[PDB]
Ligand binder design. Sequence first.
Ligand code: REA
Ligand code: REA
Lengths: 136, 136
Amino acid sequence: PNFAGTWKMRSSENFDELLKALGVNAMLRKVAVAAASKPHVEIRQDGDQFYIKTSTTVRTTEINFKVGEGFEEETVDGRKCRSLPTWENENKIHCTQTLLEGDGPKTYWTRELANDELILTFGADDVVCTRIYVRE
Amino acid sequence: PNFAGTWKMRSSENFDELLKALGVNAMLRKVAVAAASKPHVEIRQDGDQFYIKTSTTVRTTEINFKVGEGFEEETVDGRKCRSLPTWENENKIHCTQTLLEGDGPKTYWTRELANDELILTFGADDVVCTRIYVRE
Ligand SMILES: CC1=C(/C=C/C(C)=C/C=C/C(C)=C/C(=O)O)C(C)(C)CCC1
Ligand SMILES: CC1=C(/C=C/C(C)=C/C=C/C(C)=C/C(=O)O)C(C)(C)CCC1
């Protein structure tokens, strides 16, 4: 499908609850959430090759992956993991993540194109955080 | 002297050892140090009236004090204390700190203008952390 373009967030449910579940302390979550309220996202996509740049004031990330071929990226709270993206559906990628650093919570992420909308999901044990993007 | 201006750090010895000595855990020290590696500092100074704003990604602080007159600020690891700044020399301020929250280590700080350089020192029982700033 076409996830390619520059996106701006529309709404977001459960980010603090997510970070709280990942172990971040209140001092940091207040920073995270605040900055994580105005993220800019640029996505480049060539079939199964994806480049996803998510920029915010206190942290910017760039991932490059080919759906189906695992890669090394960071869990939301900045840990290190190897994740395996897979097409769950025609326009939905499910990405399983495993920490290379021993202990932690079962984390995952799933980007899906609804209808000119980009429903991003972050899981971390029960906790599901949904952030909805919209073409700028 | 003239501590007034915007400063950028040049080097830093013993910050992790300092934080480690203050009780912060490894999970947090990794965050602190990393963010505490690119601090921006703005200093406004009118004779003995000082305004010191130290900004970093996960924490920004602003203190306003008159040398000689005690004030309430926070120890590096975010505790609450009342400190008493005193001119140790013509261009060096020594600031003694006491926690309002019972237990802790004898902390202090001393900013000194060397020669267009700003040698900042943080003590916490034996442990001395020196961070050297430079006019941007
Ligand atoms: C967790 C965390 C931090 C910030 C995380 C941010 C800002 C995440 C943003 C995620 C977005 C913006 C996701 C998306 O919408 O795709 C900082 C750097 C304070 C350090 C402490 C731990
Ligand atoms: C200790 C600590 C934290 C960070 C402290 C920082 C970032 C201090 C920076 C000091 C500087 C930048 C001093 C200077 O150079 O004057 C955070 C918020 C993770 C919470 C846990 C305890």
